[PDB]
Write a protein that binds this ligand. Structure first.
Ligand SMILES: CC(=O)N[C@@H]1[C@@H](O)[C@H](O[C@@H]2O[C@H](CO)[C@H](O)[C@H](O)[C@H]2O)[C@@H](CO)O[C@H]1O
Ligand SMILES: CC(=O)N[C@@H]1[C@@H](O)[C@H](O[C@@H]2O[C@H](CO)[C@H](O)[C@H](O)[C@H]2O)[C@@H](CO)O[C@H]1O
Lengths: 847, 847
């Protein structure tokens, strides 16, 4: 009766992007916000997502303090009017918010639909009963409040993630209603794999209906791998719901894995028939994989042993603030993969849909974290105050607290995503001390999850393990988890492992080295929480600065590498983020406003430790590489005296996954050096330098301006990689560097264009801080400028006169341009006082 | 004003598939066919394309004779009713036929729109003035006549290619109205390449309008590579047309080439504005490439010297008859590429849109041929009788003959396709003898083409060069061409080259070896036109049979390989086709009905010479291979006596592109043999066997049943390929072999499922001819069965009782199943008397 193309059309039509044509106003009056035909002339017309905090100036007196990036919050309304199409008049309508920060209220046509306090969890409302009859204008108004301090890092404020509308028949698969399981995958993988599917179907009509479900599995961007599999026709009564179940067999599916960069994904297509008529159809993304984790050997994925080469990531995107964007998140995660990262932790809140989808697409394992606090709170306006209050959401179950409801709906949202392998129910929960209350709480939370999904490790991250020998009442909380995350606790691992032989252990937060891109200080010394005025609000890109409780990248990695029972780590952090500028944390009159912890700066530019990790985690067969530091501009006596040794020599270091590196100064060899090859006690091969604490090769080089070139070779002496640093002359030009020749004309895709200050030969000037002004013409929109400097208080957005400016920092920065909905092109031009201007052009059109 | 997605939607909506819901009736009455509300109950309802001849039984008295496959033609009507949508009431409507064989008439609402005699050329009609006002039902009726004999090969009858409807604004780009040129590509290729575009725009309205065109170039399935480039706004008067022109620059485009299997293609998007409103948009496929051809060095593509490794291909697809199908043509051309083919010749008629598009997509050079005759005719009902008659098409220009009009519109259709590099204006034109009439004709035809397109070689194929020394009046015709095709004229090449130093020469038809898959005869001897009753209507798969005027694959290839000034060849033929069963040509009471010339049989199964060519044309780096012949079942004394030498030994031969092959009999070596490496006088490297006439390695093997295994090695002695033949026991089962696990549910995609007769160990029985019956269940449709046997008179289609049956031939055959528009799956089951049945399942759904 119904064609495949009609089914695919219905799937498409079921969900619409509801982001366009909102009006926004800070401190708006409630009565005006919610009422029909309000005067919106003093409101800002815009397309969502929109984080309103990122447009503020930095404020030394901000109640967020510098931990929150010194950007104020407040309260605001957003409103939108819409009519249902005539064909949709009798349909069920659900409105979904992927994240609204925070304490939100949604009104439809003057009536309160719900209050949702959580700032990060997706939530949705069935709004059908609130809509106007006969297709007259409806008004949605959303109140968002960011009362500070509410957060230990930059949160952003408002509707910072997508909003979608689902329009379905009265009989439909409920929100997150699909469950897909493959309980015998490991045994069945070389033949027919039984794929058990379940659909929660809802009849919102006031008549009984005959119900059939029909399923097909297809390769995502591939071909069908099953026929149609139908359930038995049965009655679903008026206002009731039911779970239909079926088993489909897929022959030799490709297994999802982190060991490729385009892992295999599948989609389940569900068709719903009401009295023999096709009324609903949807798809659900999933993949085939299995895993195992033992105390002494750690983790394995589809039978292959691996370690979590992981990063902790906050949700902000630098100059974009909290605004979620598919392309921004893709760039960041792709950059993490290029470093050899295979896992991410969403610290410390539910992920966007974009993050989770990209992780499944790129092959990254995900630990998704529900809570930064329990009932104790960490900041007076955080989620702590809601944690034990009764959930008032109209779909909450009897007795559910906010914590029950939020945790349940997060798990239901993500329970088919193959990237997700762990659910965290908290990070550094001070009150989780093994008292009777915290014991009751941990068991309640574990059970909420296990009542939805038993296939993923329930965990928590805890720093209590780093104090003394690590033992204490908190151990009883850890016994209730499937896996136990240690924050900065390497020193107590051996003792805790002997005490708890059965625990699945990993580092949920590690290292916490602090680094400023292109800035160097006392390479010969490890500096602990060094925040004196002589540091001038910078940390060392040699990677030798770390906080009091942290470790260098080398110390935390070599520990992990050498211990098979510590299953991996999530580095604090993969990228810089706005706020927590430790070691100047909450020194509010200093200029700092963003973090030093990242391996990559907020502008998306790698610090040198990126290449350290790459050298350790990416095999020489996959991507032979070599990387030199520091720069080669040592004219300035003050810069050089902080770096040069007693003989005036610069320590030049190479990270490489090759067998040897030879360093040349102006064409003359300074000597070939060879990594020492070694084995872990369980047989894993690794390389190190001159001793166990050095993963680089090092030369002490007397300074002669020119070119330093590193030649990396395989064991047989063939060159497989090279890197080169050059002494720059004085600034002569701004140069622009496109990442993309073209992007999609969809009003969503965007591109990162780097700007650099270069001398007259085209060498980047590594000390340069020149002010750059930007012009944009054509079919694009400037949406951000950044240079990653922690101590900068420059705007990320346009100046008050509409202009776009940003200094270089150590030679570099980035401008971010978003496409419009019109095909064509845009040209970005950069200017700087007394330097040559430059422009580049990026085309826009079909994806 | 207008978004990219709206532009792409308009492009899509401009052209629709008009193939569904036609009614067909052989010998229908004209008055009933054309009139409104005819009773169609005695008509067959069907979706086009539909070749009605392929459903006939073979007929010994067919006026087609066996050269035409002994399948009758006749005359038939097709009719379809349709209403214009309300939004389309004032639009221009053009109806396009990609091919109707032949002598067609199209009626719209009782009125004759046109008579088009050509059976292969695409044609279209503006039917706007014939349509009903206010959106009442329109009737299209198409009369097709296949009065025989009209053809030297199987033509098919009726509407055997797609029909499309274009619905556009009154102001629009005319049919084939786009020209795209890159005249400085070779010079500009490393920077910005100027892409000159021209659009013929037509104003069919009776008011003047202001006209602007806007262009963008995009990578096909990639991203934009230009912005929007607009023309100056100017008036286009009522009922007039004009040519707009613009230049776009594309930076370093990827060059289209035959040396990869996914060459780079681009699309030009044109937007047309009428009084500032976007009213028309379309795209045109093209690619960037340049070529050169010199008398002494032959052809080069983008600066790389190559030879045409070419095949001649007829339009029929075996059991599909003349029905054109994208998937069938894709399979065939992909199979040609896997053999090392880089060029095709469309013998001897314009190509379908599918052929030309697939050739651009797979990287095959195309010579498209317009005529099998001029004014002389070859068969009484062929095109000869129309060639010099005045074109009556409503869009013909004053004084145009049918030959002018057909040649012009073919060139206009294909002038942007990067695969097309040569236009042929005839093949073996007997009357092109250099008399005054034929001289006038050749110059007229060359000029028709050069008035449209100067970038492609105008050519002809001629066998007059093979008689005597090759000289004669025909030389004067050849002097008028850009390139001269020699049919079977290798023996006179040296003399003709010395006589005409400036000619660009190639073999437009070569070899014409005759072969039956799996049948072997006197391998020690070259057999010339051997058609005695002892041959039992079979030819030798050793490749040693050829027609009187032909050559073996080896003799024609080694000639080409050794002569740089003979630019390549088009083998007669790439695949078998229905009709011309030489050397039993027009011996009408014999059983033969299909050709022996193909390298691949009509069922798509390679003959052994496929692997000969592959061994010569595909590099060992690209695909190391080895291939053994004959089979290893020599029990039957009569079969063996035609093959075994005087000592009873079987000559076993290996084709390979490797350095050496070692043959093993039942695990025991029969000796490693090594190809002799040699060079052409111009330095091209090649391999040969024991002497210059042997491209294989050969062993004379005393027959012991079991396994023969060939191990092919590189120079250093590493194994890079192997092949294996096994003695089969008696038939025990039918086995089915899927090419596809799944296909699209679009009612167009189809799949080839091979069936084989196997013994109880799963070895193919190479002599087996068992009758197989097929059942199909689920979402598919059987559309063909075939086994490639020339002497078979079995149906390709269903039996008169609706059943599907076909014998194996030498162990094998194929069944072809088409998808429907519903997702799901189909199961094909095969049965055979006293053997085990087998089934396979193919899924259908998203592409
Ligand atoms: C007062 C003090 O020094 N407290 C520290 C904590 O700040 C620290 O927690 C870490 O703090 C950083 C920001 O500086 C970030 O929030 C990390 O996620 C968090 O772990 C803790 C680590 O054990 O030590 C305390 O003593
Ligand atoms: C009577 C005779 O033998 N004539 C032959 C031609 O048939 C032949 O032309 C070829 O014929 C084959 C089919 O047998 C096919 O049509 C080829 O395309 C065509 O070239 C011709 C070749 O020179 O020789 C004649 O003498």
């Amino acid at each position: 009766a119904v064609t495949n193309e009609e089914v695919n059309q219905m799937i498409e039509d079921r969900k619409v992007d509801f982001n366009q044509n909102w009006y926004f106003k800070l401190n708006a009056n409630s009565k005006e916000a919610i009422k029909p035909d309000a005067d919106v002339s003093t409101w800002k017309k815009l397309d969502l997502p929109y984080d309103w905090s990122i447009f503020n100036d930095f404020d030394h007196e901000s109640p967020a303090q510098n931990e929150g990036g010194q950007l104020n919050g407040g309260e605001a309304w957003y409103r939108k009017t819409f009519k249902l199409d005539e064909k949709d008049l009798k349909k069920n309508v659900r409105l979904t918010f992927d994240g609204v920060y925070m304490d939100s209220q949604v009104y439809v046509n003057g009536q309160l639909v719900g209050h949702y306090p959580n700032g990060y969890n997706q939530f949705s409302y069935d709004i059908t009963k609130y809509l106007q009859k006969d297709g007259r204008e409806n008004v949605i108004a959303v109140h968002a409040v960011n009362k500070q301090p509410s957060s230990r890092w930059y949160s952003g404020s408002g509707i910072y993630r997508d909003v979608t509308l689902q329009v379905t028949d009265k009989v439909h698969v409920e929100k997150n209603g699909t469950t897909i399981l493959t309980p015998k995958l490991e045994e069945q993988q070389h033949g027919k794999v039984e794929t058990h599917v379940t659909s929660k179907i809802v009849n919102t009509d006031d008549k009984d209906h005959e119900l059939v479900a029909e399923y097909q599995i297809v390769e995502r961007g591939g071909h069908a791998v099953t026929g149609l599999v139908r359930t038995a026709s049965r009655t679903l009564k008026a206002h009731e719901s039911t779970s239909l179940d079926a088993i489909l067999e897929v022959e030799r599916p490709k297994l999802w894995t982190v060991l490729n960069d385009k892992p295999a994904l599948y989609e389940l297509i569900t068709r719903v028939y009401r009295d023999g008529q096709l009324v609903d159809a949807k798809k659900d993304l999933f993949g085939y994989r299995y895993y195992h984790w033992t105390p002494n050997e750690g983790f394995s994925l589809n039978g292959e042993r691996i370690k979590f080469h992981g990063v902790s990531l906050h949700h902000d995107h630098g100059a974009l603030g909290a605004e979620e964007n598919y392309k921004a998140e893709y760039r960041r995660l792709k950059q993490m993969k290029e470093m050899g990262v295979n896992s991410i932790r969403t610290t410390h809140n539910p992920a966007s849909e974009q993050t989770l989808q990209i992780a499944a697409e790129l092959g990254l394992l995900v630990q998704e974290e529900a809570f930064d606090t329990w009932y104790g709170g960490k900041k007076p306006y955080d989620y702590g105050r809601f944690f034990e209050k009764d959930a008032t959401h109209p779909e909450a179950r009897k007795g559910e607290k906010w914590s029950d409801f939020d945790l349940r709906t997060m798990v239901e949202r993500g329970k088919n995503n193959p990237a997700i392998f762990m659910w965290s129910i908290g990070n550094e929960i001070g009150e989780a001390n093994g008292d009777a209350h915290s014991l009751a709480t941990v068991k309640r939370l574990v059970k909420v999850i296990k009542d939805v999904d038993k296939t993923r490790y329930v965990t928590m991250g805890a720093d209590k393990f780093r104090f003394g020998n690590g033992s204490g009442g908190h151990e009883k909380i850890a016994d209730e988890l499937d896996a136990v995350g240690f924050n900065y606790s390497e020193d107590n691992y051996k003792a805790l492992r002997a005490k708890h032989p059965k625990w699945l252990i990993y580092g949920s937060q590690t290292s916490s080295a602090t680094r400023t891109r292109g800035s160097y200080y006392r390479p010969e010394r490890e500096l602990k929480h060094s925040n004196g005025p002589e540091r001038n609000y910078e940390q060392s890109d040699y990677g030798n600065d770390r906080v009091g409780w942290g470790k260098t990248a080398t110390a935390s990695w070599t520990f992990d590498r050498d211990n098979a029972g510590y299953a991996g780590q999530f580095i604090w952090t993969g990228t810089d983020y706005i706020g927590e500028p430790t070691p100047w944390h909450n020194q509010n009159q200093t200029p700092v406003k963003s973090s030093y912890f990242g391996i990559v700066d907020t502008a998306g530019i790698p610090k040198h430790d990126f290449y350290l990790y790459q050298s350790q985690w990416v095999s020489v067969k996959k991507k032979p590489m070599v990387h030199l530091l520091p720069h080669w501009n040592w004219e300035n006596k003050e810069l050089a005296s902080k770096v040069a040794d007693s003989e005036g020599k610069i320590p030049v270091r190479a990270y490489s996954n090759a067998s040897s590196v030879e360093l040349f100064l102006n064409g003359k060899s300074l000597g070939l050096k060879t990594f020492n090859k070694k084995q872990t006690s369980d047989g894993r091969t690794y390389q190190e330098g001159a001793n166990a604490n050095e993963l680089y090769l090092e030369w002490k080089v007397a300074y002669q301006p020119g070119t330093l070139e590193a030649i990396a070779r395989d064991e047989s002496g063939k060159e497989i990689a090279r890197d080169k640093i050059t002494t720059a002359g004085k600034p002569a030009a701004v140069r622009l560097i496109k990442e993309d020749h073209a992007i999609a004309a969809d009003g969503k895709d965007l591109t990162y264009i780097y700007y650099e200050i270069v001398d007259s030969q085209g060498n980047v000037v590594p000390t340069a801080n020149n002010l750059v002004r930007f012009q944009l013409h054509g079919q694009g929109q400037l949406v951000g400028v950044d240079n990653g400097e922690q101590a900068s208080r420059e705007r990320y957005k346009a100046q008050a006169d509409g202009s776009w400016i940003r200094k270089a920092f150590n030679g570099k920065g980035v401008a971010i341009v978003k496409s419009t909905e019109q095909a064509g092109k845009f040209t970005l031009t950069a200017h700087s006082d007394l330097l040559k201007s430059n422009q580049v052009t990026v085309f826009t059109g079909k994806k």
